[PDB]
């Protein structure tokens, strides 16, 4: 149905995302159990890690477009990523390595992420009808890799240890690299302009030098979240000042702030909703016992099923508004499940969390899956940089918000933790409902501005 290079890119993306989500699914628990962090420290350190992972994406797009070539930067990114996963596995012998190892994942993701999508865009003549379907299948590729990793990585880590889990993340990257290398001939006439000139070793060293520097900076920021906060705060207020000094751009800005709220809520899945599943949900569904950390896989699960349906099936501000209403309902459902539908021992049915994740995934499909696609319709590279930047700010804020659910390690009674989760999730859901209402009210004004 699709060009041959589509299938190469599909599977490269699948395996790279498998490696990444293998880490994301187990990282907060790894911080708590393996490194002895409090739940509060674990949550904010996860926020900083994710913030760097997402905030650096603009660098790799620049590197791919203008320094080394899209295809070269795919190879380089995959290699730095694989190295990062094996370094994380090595952190079990050398615990002092962990932040450097995570910094290497962040910088690697920063180099890699923009470039397969760029490549995929170039696999189709410019007005090919198959393009939309191709990007929906690319999103599904991301979520199949995510579904497999989030399902299996906690089970593997429990049965064989973190070293094996992380080494398997590396192996997933190695298999992305092998499928690219084996299919390289399929993209011989596809790439950015530097891809077709011989590689500049000057620029390659500038990129390796800058990457190593960034790996150390990322490690430091993750160890000292209290200045990661200030860095992103001053960077944000500054880009706010320089955006405000400098009206179809106002629609992109307001859509960026609503997306920020969405990413704050997404950040709860690997942190507070993860520990809510651990502490106050039954770990058995349809008669099968499961690792409760695996419940995170319900996000890609619902995405994989719903993207075709919603691909088959107002306009700008209203789709965003709908997504925010869905997200509000996800957290109001979590709160209600804890408030009214818990056991005498404090445990709730996992069907409530299946529904929580349905709501959150629908919110995702309306807001972020379909965000920068028509942020490109209102606008460029600068707004791409700020988009990923504000997503980083959102992850830092999300870690901070998750800390309101942190439970001390000596608590053992689910009836003590349940009201904490229900209070915080109820307030998240009510605040997000208010945001969704203000969004609805601004929809007519926004929809005129787009005219």
């Amino acid at each position, epitope marked *: 149905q699709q060009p041959r290079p589509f299938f190469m890119i599909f599977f490269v993306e699948l395996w790279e995302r498998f490696g990444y989500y293998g880490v994301q699914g187990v990282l907060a628990v790894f911080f708590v159990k393996q490194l002895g962090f409090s739940q509060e420290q674990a949550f904010v350190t996860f926020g900083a890690f994710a913030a760097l992972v997402y905030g650096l994406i603009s660098i790799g797009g620049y590197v791919g477009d203008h320094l080394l070539g899209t295809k070269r930067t795919i190879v380089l990114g995959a290699l730095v990523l694989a190295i990062g996963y094996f370094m994380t596995g090595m952190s079990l012998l050398k615990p002092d390595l962990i932040f450097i190892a995570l910094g290497t994942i962040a910088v690697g993701n920063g180099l890699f992420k923009a470039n397969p999508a760029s490549l995929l865009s170039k696999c189709y003549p410019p007005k090919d009808p198959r393009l939309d379907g191709a990007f929906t299948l690319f999103y599904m590729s991301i979520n199949i890799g995510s579904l497999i990793a989030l399902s299996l990585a906690p089970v593997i880590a429990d049965r064989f*240890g973190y070293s094996v889990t992380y080494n398997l993340c590396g192996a997933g990257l190695i298999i992305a690299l092998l499928v690219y290398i084996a299919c390289r001939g399929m993209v011989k006439d596809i790439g950015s302009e530097p891809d077709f000139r011989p590689m500049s070793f000057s620029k390659l060293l500038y990129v390796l030098l800058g990457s190593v520097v960034m790996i150390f900076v990322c490690a430091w920021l993750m160890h000292n979240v209290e200045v990661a906060n200030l860095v992103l705060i001053v960077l944000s207020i500054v880009v706010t000042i320089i955006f405000f000094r400098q009206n179809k751009m106002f629609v992109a800005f307001v859509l960026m702030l609503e997306a920020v709220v969405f990413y704050i809520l997404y950040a709860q899945m690997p942190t507070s909703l993860n*520990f809510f599943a651990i502490n106050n949900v*039954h770990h058995e569904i349809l008669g099968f016992s499961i690792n409760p950390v695996s419940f995170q896989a319900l996000n890609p699960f619902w995405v994989v099923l719903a993207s075709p349906i919603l691909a088959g099936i107002l306009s700008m501000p209203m789709k965003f508004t709908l997504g925010m209403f869905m997200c509000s309902l996800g957290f109001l459902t979590a709160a209600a499940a804890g408030m009214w539908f818990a*056991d005498a*021992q404090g*445990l709730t049915s996992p069907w409530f969390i299946v529904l929580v994740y349905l709501f959150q995934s629908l919110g995702e499909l309306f807001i972020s899956a379909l965000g920068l696609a028509m942020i490109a319709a209102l606008v460029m590279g600068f707004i791409l940089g700020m988009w990923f930047l504000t997503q980083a700010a959102a992850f830092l804020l999300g870690g901070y918000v998750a800390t309101f659910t942190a439970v001390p*390690d*000596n608590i*053992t009674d689910p009836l003590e933790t349940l009201p904490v989760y229900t209070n915080v999730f109820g307030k998240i859901g009510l605040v997000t409902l208010g945001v969704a209402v203000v969004m609805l009210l601004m929809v007519p004004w926004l929809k005129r501005m787009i005219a």
Partner: nanobody
Amino acid sequence: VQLVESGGGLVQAGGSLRLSCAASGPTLSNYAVGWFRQAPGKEREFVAGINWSSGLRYKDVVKGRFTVSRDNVKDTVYLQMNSLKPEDTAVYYCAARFGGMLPLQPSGYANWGQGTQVTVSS
């Protein structure tokens, strides 16, 4: 996923016994282990437990006599039972739930040992 209990038996009032719980494939380190007991003609009841991070919970009538502890090197959980009394006679079970919580009812736990008879004679 499968727990083996060991160390039950027959003892006189005031005596002592140590139960141990070991797991097969998974590392018990990620699991809260609760000890339940079922006396003749009654339901399983929570007796004592330790979560994945050294939190402890106890039934009131065994405080000051029972101690739960964990050796994370040998991947083993122990119930040390001192000052035993006839009414501690029961089949004892270890049960395991992932994480930091020790719920009071058997349904909070997915993984179960087979049970060890403890008898305390007057």
